[PDB]
Enzyme design. Structure first.
Site, short mmCIF file in Angstrom:
data_model
loop_
_atom_site.label_atom_id
_atom_site.label_comp_id
_atom_site.label_asym_id
_atom_site.label_seq_id
_atom_site.Cartn_x
_atom_site.Cartn_y
_atom_site.Cartn_z
N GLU B 265 4.79 1.74 -2.40
CA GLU B 265 4.02 1.11 -1.36
C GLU B 265 4.92 1.16 -0.14
O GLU B 265 6.33 1.50 -0.09
CB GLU B 265 4.16 -0.66 -1.58
CG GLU B 265 3.33 -0.79 -2.87
CD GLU B 265 3.43 -2.35 -3.19
OE1 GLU B 265 2.78 -2.55 -4.04
OE2 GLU B 265 3.92 -2.98 -2.28
N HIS B 288 -0.48 -5.81 -1.01
CA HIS B 288 0.34 -6.77 -1.54
C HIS B 288 0.58 -8.14 -0.77
O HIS B 288 1.44 -8.55 -0.62
CB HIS B 288 1.82 -6.20 -1.45
CG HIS B 288 2.82 -6.89 -2.71
ND1 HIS B 288 3.76 -6.20 -3.20
CD2 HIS B 288 2.59 -8.21 -3.11
CE1 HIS B 288 4.30 -6.85 -4.21
NE2 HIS B 288 3.78 -8.32 -4.07
#
Ligand SMILES: NC(=O)C1=CN([C@@H]2O[C@H](COP(=O)(O)OP(=O)(O)OC[C@H]3O[C@@H](n4cnc5c(N)ncnc54)[C@H](O)[C@@H]3O)[C@@H](O)[C@H]2O)C=CC1
Ligand SMILES: NC(=O)C1=CN([C@@H]2O[C@H](COP(=O)(O)OP(=O)(O)OC[C@H]3O[C@@H](n4cnc5c(N)ncnc54)[C@H](O)[C@@H]3O)[C@@H](O)[C@H]2O)C=CC1
Ligand SMILES: NC(=O)C1=CN([C@@H]2O[C@H](COP(=O)(O)OP(=O)(O)OC[C@H]3O[C@@H](n4cnc5c(N)ncnc54)[C@H](O)[C@@H]3O)[C@@H](O)[C@H]2O)C=CC1
Ligand SMILES: NC(=O)C1=CN([C@@H]2O[C@H](COP(=O)(O)OP(=O)(O)OC[C@H]3O[C@@H](n4cnc5c(N)ncnc54)[C@H](O)[C@@H]3O)[C@@H](O)[C@H]2O)C=CC1
EC number: 1.1.1.95
Lengths: 404, 406, 406, 403
Positions: B265, B288
């Site tokens: 990420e 997220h």
């Protein structure tokens, strides 16, 4: 006899329609997945006693009037604006539909929709897809403990509420009428209160003149800063550019719209809205009521209605016809649809007395142009068949039938 | 109260306001509050004299920084993850680290409900098409949640709350876990994951990050899910084989997925995102934000301020992530603490110091890891005696730090 | 509204006030309210010029009283029962009779929960022990109701409602009905009555009275019952074989029971009551007070007032228990009604008249029972034409009553 | 693990046995009822663990001659039948079950208020005598009624949830502020609660704040025609005043399960001024007497004896310092001893000398006594010499090596 009575079903109605037909005894069923072209439509409907269609098939005057044997028409759908409701009434064919079968689907859509909006999920997902990551918690909320304001506490607000409460949201509502609360829903008498108190606003209202644009610059600026606007009732209820305004103003955080004043007629036709430029708006193609489960209900209901009529003469809920329904008691039942001449009823009654027949029951109901009457009698097939033919010679008679 | 005022609390990164409210209520009123992150530079400055720090996931407390602060007592990760903080280095200096591993429960459960509601409707595909001029309204293959089976995999704090919310909405709920768990409402444990995969209309994952879960959702498994089913992952970036997920969605074996976490990420919101899932209008991708709400932040604020406050007041390192967990109930007398390297004879110097002052130990809690050891000691005694013992304690070879907490 | 003042309502046995608020809330104001029952001199006396009457269970409207009530338009039994009324007699006179079949629902479900809770707990016996001076503390044999199974026999108005409350309390809910019912909540229909008697901890009867129910719970059925289970019958007096239950109680096959109804019940609160159940402290016996609450009495006042109101205002016999049922929605115009022996030529005269006077029929609903017939006719026209017509209507040989309603 | 003997007297729930069996403890002398003084002395004379109920008395004399006995288990809430001191002196912890019947009490209350609002207790009592009394006047459904809970703890909290699932509106009075659950409203003044409630129920503890807190005054402030239920403590209600108020008909009924003075056994006479009121439920202190609670107690207290023996937790022991230690590689030893100087100093010296690292330890004291668990990293033999050496510190009541 029942299985010489042909149902033509188009546009892929749900199977349960077909199940109900068959269990009622109507086993003669020509069924189509899609809609039919002009030349096939007239081919299949030339001898159909009944038709179930949906959004797309157009029963225009000309089509209806070539349909030689057509007894009633069933819109397996909410809208009936694809049917010549008034051509149909002149040939004495009622039209049925299913107005309240989508309820759980719309309610659910809304709940799903608000959950995501309160979180900024629509926006985050649009960026995600174009490679922009936006993790932030500023702005975002759980729905638990939020105030949901439902404007329109009908079949859908009711069920919306129940869910909203299942999720622990606080439920307030406005309806131009005094509604008995379910669970702990609370009725707000003034609309400007509801707007102010509410974390999310949802509309569940009919398309009338109390509702055209019931949400303008005004009403929207009344809404809580950061709030959310959900519309999946009717396309005319909300003034799009106003909300577009309030959305760039960031006065609103986002929105969902499932209906628009103007809608693509097919799915190959283009869609257009200014809302199309906001990632924080869920834009859906009028699928508020589009689920299989909805399709199953519309299936059960509009077949149910066709069958009742065929079997008992009931026009309860017909959209273009006087509404009659009589309970079953022993005997024969006949029925007469007619122009509203005076003394059709005098003509009818004279018929049974000549033949020495007692009329156990009858229900005449009139609209401005038409009249429908269901008569129960105690008599045998011979006798009823003669009354029948006599009844067919009454001046004004549009149509008449021995139902059993 | 005049002695509380001396302990710098530094909170950066914009923690929830109730964290400050919790300090203030606990008497601790001297606080340097920052809404955002700080560069290398004003970090080391606002920290230098700082007893306690509060960061979220962007402040980087690496070794050097930890060496820089001449007075840091504990660290408070006001978030879940601790990877931004060198655990093995606050340990080295006797700084325990804290966090809020389960302060995000409703937020994730709520998000999954919304996602599966919209995915069963083909709404995400509808919204993407709509926003580019395409109308596509149909009822085939769209479905309601009510009556559908939800397969929760990993039935811990989140699975459980998710399950509850799910049956409230009319869904029949099933789950799989590697331990045997007691169901709530009408949930049902399913003994084989293939059983649970074969049945579910939706499957949603709430497991932890470890060897057992690494890629636990791979080809074979996805293949076992029901045709036309849905995959949801707001657990860990490493649980689902994404290329496999992509190949299943492309062949329409799955009808959609919502993924909130990925193998790798973006480190900030300016760093670009890519994934082979970006090509799919029928996949919700979210950055997220499973536990990113204000209710959650409010919860984390209270949790962690409490832990820091507790450590400060009574010496509890219960729940600390890089440090031996000691706690002892308040119990009349004076209380000390002592953090030391595991040198031979430390404990034995500890009681002689008290013996050699005729001081009764009413209570002692000692806990160690590898070379570290933390012990908190409750004593009946005077102050001057408590203060004297403290001095004696601080000179014991191996002593990292020690304090008289009251 | 002065029209209305003419029309006397005679209420006996003291029905709930809400009945009077509807009455007066509708312009209906000549109300001869009585709290109690009337004797014959009191009744003929007070009924002779009554237009309506509301009674309850004790008032005996016989043919000799009815054939005296000179202005008696309709009869409301502010109750479930109508056995105290002579229906054929009032039908012979063109007098609808109405009642409240399903107004006791919550009051009956609420009783069964209370009872089953205390029965499972062996409370009735400990109570009667206490009052006689004996202390009996034990835990053998007592149970909470959560997670026990309720078998409901008869899944209708009360059954449905019974199961909802039972689920609120965490019971498992099973029902057996002769017809197929849509289960509410998580209720489960059991197809063979014997499995239901087999699984259930408590079985509550909620069926009608009739040959299919008569003694339908006998020695066979009682033994199919789970050891140490509980029976509850607040349906009807004929459905349980009391001496069978008494034997199963004696033998402890059953743990207890609650009977609110009986094959033979005292005529008044002055007559003694006997039962071989009287011998058993672990049985609740209740004087047929299943639906005896004030909320229930208020449901009744509303339902039955509304109906007599509706009939007086719009002809509706929808619901009558002895009369043809007719109802027409409202719209534009004036509205006639006409009650007649069904004689050759009635409907012919009706229509002859309307065409004598020139009146166009908007809607007409005729229904018949045997020799009795009732027709309600909406017509569009002005008051001189109307009352010209209605005077001819009373002349038709057969007519019993005709009224220009509005 | 078979050499360890449990004596369970008075029919503890079978879940207690199922649990001891699970945890691998199979030597069980089970007894449906209480032992008389010779049997008890004989079954216990070698027992490690006794699990009793409220009728057994473990007195000093019995406890003291109890040779092999390590911990006591009250499968119950009371521990007044157990001499806690005699038990500590000999280093024997006493466990019990503080709150294992919250639902049972809440259920009893729901059933009682529902019937009491219908006059069912009088009605039933009358019907057992021949008297039929069918009446609607004064009979009431629960839904839509105000229930006032005095004491909003484990049981009050729960009761309000049930009441709410029935459709009652729930109010409460507590001497502190609490977070209402569901639609519950906290009511700041007792008098205001009392005036508004159709049914008042009580769930406070026994203490001075509590003694006759419902007296003539409070009863008279209750709404004319309301109900009072007490399944809390016998000392909370001025009974004579309640009598009076049932006699004058200010209250339509009550339900009392606890009394200032209670029979000691089922065989002793029960008396009370309330006995004359058919509209009053009277119950022999069974607010918690159910199988579900007996089972809950079964797992709990079996749980605590198993835990003490396997790992030395004395968490919740009612007569012992509470120490608890998570588990780690190594051996684990245990010392109980008289609280006096340098025990801990000699404890720790033993390990210093055999050169054995102490992985952790937790000691806690009372005035009179001390308990300490020790995790050490060593083979079995060295732990043994250590045991033997710890057994010798003057002051040692007892020492054991657990694993
Ligand atoms: N997006 C979709 O696929 C579908 C849209 N709908 C629409 O939802 C709307 C309502 O649905 P239902 O609950 O079934 O209708 P309903 O007739 O049962 O209830 C509508 C409610 O709104 C109230 N109302 C009427 N005018 C109002 C005024 N303007 N201000 C405030 N309240 C007003 C009425 O009192 C009524 O309670 C309709 O337009 C229906 O067509 C329904 C199904 C699907
Ligand atoms: N995306 C996001 O915003 C966030 C992600 N999460 C993640 O969600 C996950 C679950 O969170 P909680 O429910 O609070 O954790 P939890 O520890 O309370 O629940 C995990 C459960 O999964 C079970 N489990 C372990 N290995 C398994 C395996 N191989 N297969 C099946 N079950 C297994 C465990 O027995 C345990 O019951 C964690 O990884 C957490 O980090 C949590 C919050 C936010
Ligand atoms: N104790 C009391 O004061 C009161 C007693 N009742 C009685 O309770 C009974 C039930 O009342 P409701 O719920 O309104 O009735 P209901 O008609 O709504 O319910 C009866 C249900 O039982 C089913 N059933 C019929 N025969 C059956 C059989 N042989 N075996 C199993 N099921 C059968 C029916 O199909 C129906 O679904 C009636 O007898 C009513 O008179 C009603 C009110 C008060
Ligand atoms: N009859 C039986 O079988 C049983 C009786 N009980 C009794 O019920 C009572 C309640 O039990 P739990 O809920 O477990 O206790 P709890 O400790 O959870 O709750 C007590 C509550 O009452 C409050 N309180 C204390 N003094 C007060 C005062 N003067 N006025 C108002 N509130 C006050 C406290 O704030 C606390 O909230 C206890 O006495 C218990 O022994 C409990 C179980 C069974």
């Amino acid at each position: 006899e029942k299985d010489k009575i042909k149902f033509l079903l188009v546009e892929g109605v749900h199977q349960k329609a077909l199940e109900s037909l068959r269990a009622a005894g109507y086993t003669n069923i020509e069924f189509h997945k899609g809609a039919l072209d002009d030349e096939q439509l007239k081919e299949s409907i030339r001898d159909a006693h009944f038709i179930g269609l949906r959004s797309r098939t157009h029963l225009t005057e000309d089509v209806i009037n070539a349909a030689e044997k057509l007894v009633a028409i069933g819109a397996f759908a909410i809208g009936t604006n694809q049917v010549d409701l008034d051509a149909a009434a002149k040939r004495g064919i009622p039209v049925f539909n299913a107005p309240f079968s989508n309820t759980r689907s719309v309610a659910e859509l809304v709940i799903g929709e608000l959950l995501l909006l309160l979180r900024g999920v629509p926006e985050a997902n649009a960026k995600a897809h174009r490679g922009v990551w936006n993790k932030l918690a500023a702005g975002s909320f759980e729905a638990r403990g939020k105030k949901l304001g439902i404007i329109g506490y009908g079949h859908i607000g009711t069920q919306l509420g129940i869910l909203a409460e299942s999720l622990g949201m606080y439920v307030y509502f406005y309806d131009i009428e005094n509604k008995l609360p379910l669970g702990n829903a609370t009725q707000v008498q003034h609309l400007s209160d509801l707007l102010n108190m509410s974390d999310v606003v949802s509309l569940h209202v009919p398309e009338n003149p109390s509702t055209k644009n019931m949400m303008g610059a005004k009403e929207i600026s009344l809404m809580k800063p950061g709030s959310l606007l959900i519309n999946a009732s009717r396309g005319t209820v909300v003034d799009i550019p106003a909300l577009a305004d309030a959305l760039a103003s960031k006065h609103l955080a986002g929105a969902a719209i499932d209906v628009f004043p103007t809608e693509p007629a097919t799915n190959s036709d283009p869609f257009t809205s200014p809302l199309a430029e906001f990632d924080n708006v869920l834009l859906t193609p009028h699928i508020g009521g589009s689920t299989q489960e909805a399709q199953e209900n519309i299936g059960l209901e509009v077949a149910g209605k066709l069958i009742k009529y065929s079997d008992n003469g009931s026009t309860l809920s017909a959209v273009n016809f006087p509404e009659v329904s009589l309970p079953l008691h022993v005997g024969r039942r006949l029925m007469h649809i007619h122009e509203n001449r005076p003394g059709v009823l005098t003509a009818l009654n004279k018929i049974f007395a000549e033949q020495g027949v007692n009329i156990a029951a009858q229900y005449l109901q009139t609209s401005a142009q038409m009249g429908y009457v269901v008569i129960d009698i105690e008599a045998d097939e011979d006798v009823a068949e003669k009354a029948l033919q006599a009844m067919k010679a009454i001046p004004g008679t549009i149509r008449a039938r021995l139902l059993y």
